Amino acid sequence: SLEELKKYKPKKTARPDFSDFWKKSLEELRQVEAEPTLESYDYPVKGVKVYRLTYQSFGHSKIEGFYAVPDQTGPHPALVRFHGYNASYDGGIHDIVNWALHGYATFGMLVRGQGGSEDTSVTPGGHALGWMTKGILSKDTYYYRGVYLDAVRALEVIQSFPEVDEHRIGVIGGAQGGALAIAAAALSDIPKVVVADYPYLSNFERAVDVALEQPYLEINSYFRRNSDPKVEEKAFETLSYFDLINLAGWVKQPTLMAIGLIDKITPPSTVFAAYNHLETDKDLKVYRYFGHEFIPAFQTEKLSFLQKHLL
Amino acid sequence: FDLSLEELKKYKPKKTARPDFSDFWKKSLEELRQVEAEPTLESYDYPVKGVKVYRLTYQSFGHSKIEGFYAVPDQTGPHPALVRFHGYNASYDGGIHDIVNWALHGYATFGMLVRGQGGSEDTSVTPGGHALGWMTKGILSKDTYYYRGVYLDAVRALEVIQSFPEVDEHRIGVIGGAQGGALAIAAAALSDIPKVVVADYPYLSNFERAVDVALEQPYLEINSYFRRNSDPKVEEKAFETLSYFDLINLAGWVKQPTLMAIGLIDKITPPSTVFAAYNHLETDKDLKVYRYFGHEFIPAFQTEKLSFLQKHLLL
Amino acid sequence: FDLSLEELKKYKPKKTARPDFSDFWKKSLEELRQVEAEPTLESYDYPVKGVKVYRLTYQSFGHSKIEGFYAVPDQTGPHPALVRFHGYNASYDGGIHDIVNWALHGYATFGMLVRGQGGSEDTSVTPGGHALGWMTKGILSKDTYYYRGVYLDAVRALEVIQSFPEVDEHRIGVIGGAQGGALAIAAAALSDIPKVVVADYPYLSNFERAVDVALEQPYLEINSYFRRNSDPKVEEKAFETLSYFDLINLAGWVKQPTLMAIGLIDKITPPSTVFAAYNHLETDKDLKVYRYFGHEFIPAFQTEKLSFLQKHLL
Amino acid sequence: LFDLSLEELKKYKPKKTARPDFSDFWKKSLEELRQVEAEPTLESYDYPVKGVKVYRLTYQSFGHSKIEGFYAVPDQTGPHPALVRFHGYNASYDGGIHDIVNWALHGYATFGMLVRGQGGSEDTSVTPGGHALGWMTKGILSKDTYYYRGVYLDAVRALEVIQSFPEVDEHRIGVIGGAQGGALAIAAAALSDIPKVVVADYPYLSNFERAVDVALEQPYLEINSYFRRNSDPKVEEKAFETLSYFDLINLAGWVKQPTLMAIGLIDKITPPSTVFAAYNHLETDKDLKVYRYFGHEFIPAFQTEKLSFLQKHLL
Amino acid sequence: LSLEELKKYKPKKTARPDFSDFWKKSLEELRQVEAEPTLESYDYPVKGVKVYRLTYQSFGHSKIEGFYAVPDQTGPHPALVRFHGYNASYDGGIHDIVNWALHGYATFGMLVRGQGGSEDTSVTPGGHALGWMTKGILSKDTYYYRGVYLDAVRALEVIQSFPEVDEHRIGVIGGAQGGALAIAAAALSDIPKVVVADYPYLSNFERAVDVALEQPYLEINSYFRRNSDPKVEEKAFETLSYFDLINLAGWVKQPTLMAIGLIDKITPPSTVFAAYNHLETDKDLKVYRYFGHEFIPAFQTEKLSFLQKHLL
Amino acid sequence: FDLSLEELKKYKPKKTARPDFSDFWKKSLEELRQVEAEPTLESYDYPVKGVKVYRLTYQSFGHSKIEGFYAVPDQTGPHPALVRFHGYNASYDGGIHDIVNWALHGYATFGMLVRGQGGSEDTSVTPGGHALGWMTKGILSKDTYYYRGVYLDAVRALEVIQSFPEVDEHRIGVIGGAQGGALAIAAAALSDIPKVVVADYPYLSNFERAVDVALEQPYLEINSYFRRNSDPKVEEKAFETLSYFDLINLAGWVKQPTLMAIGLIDKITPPSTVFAAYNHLETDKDLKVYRYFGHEFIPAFQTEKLSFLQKHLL
Ligand SMILES: O[C@@H]1[C@@H](O)[C@H](O)OC[C@H]1O
Ligand SMILES: O[C@@H]1[C@@H](O)[C@H](O)OC[C@H]1O
Ligand SMILES: O[C@@H]1[C@@H](O)[C@H](O)OC[C@H]1O
Ligand SMILES: O[C@@H]1[C@@H](O)[C@H](O)OC[C@H]1O
Ligand SMILES: [Cl-]
Ligand SMILES: [Cl-]
Ligand SMILES: [Cl-]
Ligand SMILES: [Cl-]
Ligand SMILES: [Cl-]
Ligand SMILES: [Cl-]
Ligand SMILES: [Cl-]
Ligand SMILES: [Cl-]
Ligand SMILES: [Cl-]
Ligand SMILES: [Cl-]
Ligand SMILES: [Cl-]
Ligand SMILES: [Cl-]
Ligand SMILES: [Cl-]
Ligand SMILES: [Cl-]
Ligand SMILES: [Cl-]
Ligand SMILES: [Cl-]
Ligand SMILES: [Cl-]
């Protein structure tokens, strides 16, 4: 119930070496030269310049994404946008450009092997169909390790741009994107604000027992194929290093979140769990009649919130 | 839902192989040969009597470590052998129970696990975005395509098995269903080690039609790919890549006796895609058609399978 | 699921228009002209920069008050303009976010809301029973049919927009998908105000085939109607009424450049019904065919849409 | 099972949501209705039945709407007892003439009123603004413009018309219906003293605030679709305010006639709790038939009850 | 197929040389059993109609049940034997029976062995798919519908023998399975004067199994999946041929009224047209474009009108 | 979708057995004894090496001829033996491949086919109407109920196997899943011939709860029955009949070591119905709980099964 959801705050599952793991990971990332590249890209828009932007990241993977900038003298405020799980079509260029038309230098980072970008990370062994369980038996090999770092590197690259006001950079996204937005804000102090639509990758131990649809269930499919009890124990150990309930505590930027009460993909409880772990200026928008989908009303909130803090 | 039986019997789509088809594989096999197998065996406890069970790994294309269980009849050989390939994302606990049962039928059996699926390592980089699944990983290039490494692993597997002392290299067979049947055929086409081939409704065949006739996963992964990459050239390049791995192009190299099965109401590996591969085989072959079965275990064909293998390898 | 492409490219069903087709509309436009627009603008706050947003209403057929958001680029014009029509029962919050984004692309945009759906008033009486939905309201007579008022509202909308000072009347376009695309085409056919037309898989086309080929709502609303009214004459009269609103009969009056899209696996607006309308257009036209898309947002066509509108209006 | 426990259902009695002007609203509505001349009309209608006369009956009602319906009377000297039958939501085919005629064959002068724009009848009421696909939310932002305002009055006027017939014993008139029909039967009995008995199969339009959170199928969910399209918080508040004027938990209190109701425990359309809520608000001779293994459908066993109950009170 | 093709679809009969002999013998075995009918008053909230429970002995000495409703007045009244759909009988469909009586017909709703009611003594030879469709399917002598068909015949014999029943005005009606029993009964007996069958089932079996999209025809497919032996399939269809309507229709000489919904997935239009096109008698088929395997209001008027004309 | 694991571990519904429970079976076993087994063996060709395969029939309750494949390790015995029972309407080609594989594991195995399902004759008359399926055949009386004959066939099967020379009567086991597991437990309860019992998510247990918790067939066959027979007494009598065959009433007679499995997301044999049976066992027992599996083949439990049988028989 809404009354219980408002109070649901599961106990962190972070291991003693939680922060050490990330400290090291950030370091390995730092050992890679960004070597960013910009390439003009033609698009039927007036008042905005569009480019294709790539840069080197963790494991020497080349990360892609479209970069749209308001066509005028800046520095303009900027946004790094993250897309949903297996939900990126044509690098979501139309969204990127529209954000630019709203006055934001925007870059839509494409998640490794999904919407685009290269993934050099080896596949240690078998796993369920999907990205959720690639290299899940070790925090070092897990899929989202590289992804999280790419999100951080993305901010480093954007911030370094001359036409970008480094003091007015925001991160936004829904589900997977919202999770990347929060993880990036937790692992970096570059973003000034965070907006996350029903964030994914949160409260994994409950998610696998409450979700009714993919992709959380990819973990269940994994356990079905690997009956060893130790596998389950090790898998959840790995996931704890990437769980939002453990990362939320490091977020110090103002955060705006949304949750649809009939969401079957990113269950309300998993989202409230992340929200209730945030120790910063925050606000959660609850929509009774919406699920894992585009919520018109929240779009107004999003625009208003970003405008207030960046525009 | 697919073609009638009269048309199916005559369906033989034009090969889509490019001029460099055989060259591509010739090079691929070479790169594979540049990797030392360095196989390893490790005893594995299992509640069976009369059979020895092991965990077997070996190095393959791109230096990937391939896994799989290896069961051998507990007695003096050399015993005939079988390399078994599992279905797409359909491997549970490395299918050990099946492996062991095959051994109990008198065969030295190895169930190779497909890269990143049932097990095994996949070192191959992911060039760029692709649809959820393995079907489109590195699909924009025959060199980077997922099944390139897999096919080679299948070949290397045979090289490893054959080299075993307790294995009669003249009585080695390859079996599998769907993805497994496709790997069985591809291995026989790329190697002369196997003496016989059994493939239950083979997958990875007649791609250009499959994407227009399949009603369920995983062929539709290709469709999802094109939805996310509207560029017309992408489609053209993707099918170019697939042609190098299509069974209608590999079948022609199979010279071993082949037994195949097809369920007429199969929605995953459409009858037409399977007949297409079959009609491209130029060797002793036989296709078992089951009117009331789909993409599933077909009891009646199991008898055929056993009988066929027994005749050519066992008795 | 539909008929081969090679056949689709040649599918051109025989018009079903009755002798009084054009007369019916001539009279309808007249009745509409007997109503004073009396438009109204009201500022509306929206978290956007560089665009002014308003709520716009005006009187139309049967004295119905029509609603819609109106967004204009915040700067000296006259700016080119677009009248956007939304899909069947597919309007949320008057689709304000789309309206505003169009304005941000440099177009004075008005998203007309279809009577009783996304908004707007519908004074038209309900003659008798009909299936759940709008598709069969007053279907037993062309005078009482639901889309009669809607079509006229679309026309009146253009009259209102065109009269605006910050709007260049020579650069006005109509766009929409499914129901919206049908309204865009119908408006261009009944008026000469719009310069260009863009229609994503248009609805309300080739009714007699649609009811035998569609796999999902809302075309099937007609089938539900016939199930509840077994009288043979009802079916005959219903299709007679529909003929006056069918795109295969209106397309012939469209003289503006038209851009259309169709997803080959569309179950709602079957490919054949869309090709039928397209093949009846006698004007500069182009149909974008997408093999792997259905009745949904097609990213690739969005580029075409922007490009086409930019070329003809910007 | 999916709703509240049977033990809890028997005690579920939600607090009325009626506003201070509840009874005033209806008092005025009945008055506006009275300002319209019925001007009924009868027209012979041919039907393959023996022993029954069938007619088409229309009459003027609220907003000057012409209401339709078939009228069947036992072919013999009366006055006969009479029934006004109301049909389910968008569930009327050919004006349900076969049911009408069968009721007449049971000895009842029967009239099946057709709900505005659904099974038949005219609806003059204007559509104030946008609303969800369906009738549930037409003019929902005001009790004066709400769809069921005209419908309820039509049901009342129907009774006035029937009662005035010479071949009808005004002291033996009943109202029956299921779901929407049962709701109209109860509403009519609450707003009129003409009917002697009421039978309602799992009544609809009851306990709206809970219904929208418990229903698993249409048409209650039309309200949810409405709120999805109109995010304004005030809209929700105003919509429920409007619904309260038509909610059975607020009208039941005015029912003084003997009432028979049925509820299927696995009903997903008219959830058991919404039905028990209406029943528990009735202050009159009543009886609720509970069927564990039935849902929103025809319940054979309750048909016997229905016939037996009507026969006892009217026959 | 298209309505144009459906109108001409007339599959070749599958009847074996001993077709008529099989039934001739079956009718004889039936005749060796004493009906010994029984009537028992049954209370029902109806006025103007008397209701009873009627049982009688049939093939294999099975006791057949059913409700019997008669107009409460001096007859003899015309009569109807109603057959219910496959596994579609609730409370012996008493409400329908009673309503028919209220329409002026002495009506008996025979309940099909083990389904809506009635006893089934026939042994189960061996394994078969879940359902009745394949019980004893490996032999025409042991097949489930053999006993059912005969019960339908015996039912007419019993009804006809009633004093309050005009034996020259007896009809048989039913939908799907019921319609199949109505036709089969008219083909195996000359007692009924008219036949009404809503989208008849048990027709054109060899095509039905390849065209049906839902149960219960698919029960045959389930059977073949569980019994891979090729001979099993051959023998099964051999058995079915003895009960197929395309082989029985030719013996129907009574006026017949049929209905078919073009979107029917249970009793595919082609299987129904196949039966219809094999009828050599006064007949008429009502085609409904927008209806499937369900109650069709418009056809109900036709049904009433047709029965009224020929019996009323 | 059931209760918590904490509650399941403690769920032990009150037995529903009637005073004449044990008397009913005592008589039933007697009637069975009045029938001469008259078993028959017939060689059957199968592409296997090291195993002999036969078709075995024998007479049982009501003089029904029961079938099944019989595979024996091709070597000098006596070998340990297994009687395998198949799932509800889940037998294809008499599951010969499984039978033969068991034999290859060293067990003389007989896969009894359940009356009218996988094979075997069912002479029992059908008293009256019932729902589509076997679950409610003759449900209005314990004497006429379908599973009465089936249970006895299971017992007679053990009598026949035990009597074989190549079979060590002190090492005979019964195994099965769902319906098969229910037959394995019932047989062990009605006979002292089997030394061990293995039952995968046993069916036919805790009927009164099952009908309110099951989400799929075949338990729901009972619900279909009550829908077609509204008489309140019917329901009462039906559950009375079922009580005589419910595992929660038979489990108490099982004295052999028992191994059971349950998938927590099982919708066919709900976890609670299986735990109810398990918690009524008063013998060496162990229940394997699988969180991510349902009514299906569970690889991990197969290892347990093999290991358990090997320990007690091989
Ligand atoms: O899913 C919904 C979509 O269908 C609609 O178009 O916009 C709002 C979304 O929530
Ligand atoms: O119970 C009835 C059944 O016997 C009949 O066949 O179909 C209608 C049902 O209501
Ligand atoms: O199937 C239809 C049913 O849903 C409706 O209620 O009554 C008419 C039938 O044809
Ligand atoms: O249902 C699963 C099946 O699909 C797989 O093949 O084997 C393991 C089972 O649990
Ligand atoms: Cl891993
Ligand atoms: Cl959702
Ligand atoms: Cl909401
Ligand atoms: Cl690629
Ligand atoms: Cl399939
Ligand atoms: Cl088959
Ligand atoms: Cl109308
Ligand atoms: Cl679609
Ligand atoms: Cl496409
Ligand atoms: Cl309103
Ligand atoms: Cl329901
Ligand atoms: Cl019930
Ligand atoms: Cl048989
Ligand atoms: Cl149907
Ligand atoms: Cl029709
Ligand atoms: Cl399950
Ligand atoms: Cl598990």
PDB file of N, CA, C and O in Angstrom, chain B residues 13-24:
ATOM      1  N   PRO B  13      15.262 -22.703 -52.046  1.00  0.00           N
ATOM      2  CA  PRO B  13      15.695 -21.326 -52.294  1.00  0.00           C
ATOM      3  C   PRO B  13      17.109 -21.218 -52.852  1.00  0.00           C
ATOM      4  O   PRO B  13      17.974 -22.032 -52.550  1.00  0.00           O
ATOM      5  N   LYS B  14      17.343 -20.197 -53.665  1.00  0.00           N
ATOM      6  CA  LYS B  14      18.650 -19.999 -54.259  1.00  0.00           C
ATOM      7  C   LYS B  14      19.667 -19.611 -53.207  1.00  0.00           C
ATOM      8  O   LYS B  14      19.423 -18.726 -52.402  1.00  0.00           O
ATOM      9  N   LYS B  15      20.806 -20.297 -53.213  1.00  0.00           N
ATOM     10  CA  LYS B  15      21.876 -20.019 -52.265  1.00  0.00           C
ATOM     11  C   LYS B  15      22.164 -18.515 -52.216  1.00  0.00           C
ATOM     12  O   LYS B  15      22.003 -17.805 -53.205  1.00  0.00           O
ATOM     13  N   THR B  16      22.579 -18.034 -51.055  1.00  0.00           N
ATOM     14  CA  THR B  16      22.899 -16.622 -50.885  1.00  0.00           C
ATOM     15  C   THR B  16      24.385 -16.418 -50.601  1.00  0.00           C
ATOM     16  O   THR B  16      24.812 -15.325 -50.248  1.00  0.00           O
ATOM     17  N   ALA B  17      25.170 -17.472 -50.758  1.00  0.00           N
ATOM     18  CA  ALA B  17      26.595 -17.391 -50.504  1.00  0.00           C
ATOM     19  C   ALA B  17      27.295 -16.409 -51.429  1.00  0.00           C
ATOM     20  O   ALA B  17      26.998 -16.335 -52.614  1.00  0.00           O
ATOM     21  N   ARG B  18      28.215 -15.639 -50.860  1.00  0.00           N
ATOM     22  CA  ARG B  18      28.996 -14.665 -51.613  1.00  0.00           C
ATOM     23  C   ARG B  18      30.217 -15.377 -52.220  1.00  0.00           C
ATOM     24  O   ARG B  18      30.599 -16.464 -51.779  1.00  0.00           O
ATOM     25  N   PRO B  19      30.845 -14.772 -53.237  1.00  0.00           N
ATOM     26  CA  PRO B  19      32.019 -15.360 -53.893  1.00  0.00           C
ATOM     27  C   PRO B  19      33.091 -15.810 -52.910  1.00  0.00           C
ATOM     28  O   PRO B  19      33.742 -16.822 -53.128  1.00  0.00           O
ATOM     29  N   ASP B  20      33.263 -15.057 -51.828  1.00  0.00           N
ATOM     30  CA  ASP B  20      34.282 -15.370 -50.827  1.00  0.00           C
ATOM     31  C   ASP B  20      33.789 -16.275 -49.704  1.00  0.00           C
ATOM     32  O   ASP B  20      34.433 -16.385 -48.665  1.00  0.00           O
ATOM     33  N   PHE B  21      32.650 -16.922 -49.909  1.00  0.00           N
ATOM     34  CA  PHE B  21      32.101 -17.815 -48.898  1.00  0.00           C
ATOM     35  C   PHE B  21      33.155 -18.793 -48.360  1.00  0.00           C
ATOM     36  O   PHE B  21      33.581 -18.691 -47.214  1.00  0.00           O
ATOM     37  N   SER B  22      33.569 -19.736 -49.196  1.00  0.00           N
ATOM     38  CA  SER B  22      34.560 -20.736 -48.811  1.00  0.00           C
ATOM     39  C   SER B  22      35.887 -20.151 -48.350  1.00  0.00           C
ATOM     40  O   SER B  22      36.591 -20.755 -47.536  1.00  0.00           O
ATOM     41  N   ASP B  23      36.234 -18.979 -48.867  1.00  0.00           N
ATOM     42  CA  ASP B  23      37.477 -18.343 -48.470  1.00  0.00           C
ATOM     43  C   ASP B  23      37.371 -17.886 -47.016  1.00  0.00           C
ATOM     44  O   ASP B  23      38.305 -18.058 -46.226  1.00  0.00           O
ATOM     45  N   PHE B  24      36.222 -17.309 -46.673  1.00  0.00           N
ATOM     46  CA  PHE B  24      35.969 -16.825 -45.321  1.00  0.00           C
ATOM     47  C   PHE B  24      36.185 -17.932 -44.306  1.00  0.00           C
ATOM     48  O   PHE B  24      36.856 -17.737 -43.300  1.00  0.00           O
TER      49      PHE B  24
END
